[PDB]
Amino acid sequence: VNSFSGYLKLTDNVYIKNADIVEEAKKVKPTVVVNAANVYLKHGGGVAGALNKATNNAMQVESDDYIATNGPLKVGGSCVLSGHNLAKHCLHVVGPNVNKGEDIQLLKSAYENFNQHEVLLAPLLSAGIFGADPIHSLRVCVDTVRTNVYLAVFDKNLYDKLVSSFL
């Protein structure tokens, strides 16, 4: 039993809510919040800009040190950093950004990173300003992630569409 509230059950292990992931993080303080990152960990907009803003830019400062030491992530890859005031840890996961012309096939690899964590609060990877089909991303999530994932969808119309079309 955990502290997430008002989530709709999609499958055995995947739940979904129309909510601001930042506000969900502040309320639950999960062990892991997932960031929809890019390979440079430059947290400008979307989930990343929103999470980073909520940390008062501490996420960005930590991320810049990470990149200076390790270089960029791979598309489909991830790293574990601090969750700052939002969570114990932040799992920065790079899904493909279709508006950058990146390989849609790497979305499954991106979701595989979730399987290293028993429970996660996460956004829908590659959706929103990342430009992929969100119905497709949800199918990949449910078909790839085996651990317990609580998906927070910001856009109300998007949430309603995702629920109403889910197989």
Tell me which residues touch ligand A1CKL (CB under 6 A). Answer: 20-22, 36, 46-47, 50, 123-125, 127-130, 153-155, 158
Q: How far is the CB of 69 from ligand A1CKL (least distance, A)?
A: 25
**Considering the complex, what minimum distance in angstroms separates the CB of residue 49 from ligand A1CKL?**
7
Based on CB atoms, which residue is closest to ligand A1CKL, 1 or 76? 76
DSSP-based three-state secondary structure for 80: strand
Q: By C-beta, is 76 or 128 nearer to ligand A1CKL?
A: 128
Q: How far apart are CA 23 and CA 54, in angstroms?
A: 9
Give helix then strand counts, H and E, for the chain.
6, 7
| Residue (of 95, 112, 103, 97) closest to 147 by Cα position | 112
> Cβ closer to ligand A1CKL: 68 or 144?
144
Burial class of residue 130 (count of CB atoms within 10 Å of its CB; 0-12, 13-18, 19+): buried
Rounded least distance, CB 15 to ligand A1CKL, Å:
14
